[PDB]
Curated annotation (Swiss-Prot), chain A:
Organism name: Severe acute respiratory syndrome coronavirus 2 (2019-nCoV)
Range covered out of full length: 953 to 1001 of 1273
Protein name from the UniProt record: Spike protein S2'
UniProt gene name: S
Function: Subunit of the fusion protein that is processed upon entry into the host cell. Mediates fusion of the virion and cellular membranes by functioning as a class I viral fusion protein. Contains a viral fusion peptide that is unmasked after S2 cleavage. This cleavage can occur at the cell membrane by host TMPRSS2 or during endocytosis by host CSTL. In either case, this triggers an extensive and irreversible conformational change that leads to fusion of the viral envelope with the cellular cytoplasmic membrane, releasing viral genomic RNA into the host cell cytoplasm.
Organism domain of life: Viruses
Residue ranges of coiled coil: 1-41
Lineage: Viruses, Riboviria, Orthornavirae, Pisuviricota, Pisoniviricetes
Length: 49, 50
């Protein structure tokens, strides 16, 4: 039960935004310019770490 | 206020129109409007001082 709970929470955490425009990297890449993408990407990186 | 939907959008005519004084986009990159898909488009026009 504990192993299943931990794995489910870890996989569920991938849908959080962490104060960004979107929670999907492909959407961010296909809607913006690389100079304006690092600002959004950093928040996701920090949250997932 | 004009609402635009259910059509194919091309933005080459935007550059063809005039030598714009200003062209600023906030949520999108101006060079990549050619590859996106939107639900509804709202067009608003008026005259303001320079």
């Amino acid at each position: 039960n504990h192993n299943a709970q931990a794995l489910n929470t870890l996989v569920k955490q991938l849908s959080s935004k962490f104060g960004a425009i979107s929670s999907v990297l492909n959407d961010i890449l296909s809607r913006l310019d690389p100079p304006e993408a690092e600002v959004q990407i950093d928040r996701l990186i920090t949250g997932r770490l | 206020r004009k609402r635009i939907s259910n059509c194919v959008a091309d933005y080459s005519v935007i550059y063809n129109f005039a030598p714009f004084f200003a062209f600023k986009c906030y949520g999108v990159s101006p060079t990549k409007l050619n590859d996106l898909c939107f639900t509804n488009v709202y067009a608003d026009s008026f005259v303001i001082r320079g």
